[PDB]
């Protein structure tokens with residue numbers, strides 16, 4: 666069911682544009698070439714516990 | 718926080734603490750970015766002049782990784798009133814930017830629709846703070862976190878002695894002795910999704926703490942995302 670099915674395989678935000686899954690990300694993350702994964706840009710991306 | 722567990726190293730990096738002139742925490746906050754803190758509007762009444770401390774886990778001794786920040790601008794939601802406690806939300810613009818490190822990191826802001834469809838429909842969320850660990854007691858010196866179940870909308874309105882507006886939501890336990898408590902207000906309510914935590918609520922209020930038949934009342938962040946966006950730009 667697109668986004669209704671396991672968040673449409675998106676790491677973060679999942680939308681439906683023209684009846685198809687569209688993944689997006691929060692600030693500080695870039696959408697990966699696969700258009701599904703979110704790649705953090707810095708050492709302290711939002712929403713991640715600091716476990717160093 | 719009554720019950721729950723103390724936040725181990727780096728587990729709750731987005732927690733913020735509002736400290737008055739006497740360096741004591743009276744409310745919590747959520748780090749949104751290097752310049753902004755999210756909190757409850759009702760907290761702005763609890764003090765005359767306050768600062769924001771980040772990266773602390775033990776109030777007693779100065780650990781070494783904490784930092785105090787002065788507030789440059791206080792953005793209080795104009796529709797708030799102690800009469801209803803509706804619109805219990807405020808944004809703080811800090812004078813100097815927060816430097817991220819261990820125990821100091823922002824929580825992600827979700828997009829309205831997705832958040833409602835994917836985060837709010839989750840079984841649980843996490844609340845944290847330095848509030849009382851018992852209904853009758855002092856403010857905890859250790860930062861604690863607690864997993865609280867999302868509570869049925871209809872079910873919670875029945876349990877409340879006050880009108881639950883659409884800008885509010887319930888989380889917690891009907892009987893089980895685990896709940897937020899006094900002092901945890903303004904603090905973070907975050908929902909985990911694939912090892913990433915999004916801010917979903919703000920500790921607003923509760924009829925006591927952990928009482929049977931009662932729940933914790935949080936401000937629904939999805940209802941103010943736009944307001945939050947405008948507040949972070951102005």
Ligand SMILES: O=C(N[C@H]1CCCC[C@H]1NC(=O)c1ccc2c(Cl)c[nH]c2c1)c1ccc(-n2ccccc2=O)cc1
Nearest residue numbers: 800801802879897898899921922923924925926933934
């Ligand atoms: O917080 C209140 N009372 C406080 C003072 C009396 C003793 C209990 C104390 N509890 C807290 O500090 C507290 C804060 C957050 C949470 C969460 Cl989450 C879970 N447990 C708690 C407990 C309080 C404030 C406003 C309303 N109220 C609601 C609508 C309209 C008018 C109105 O006054 C009711 C209760």
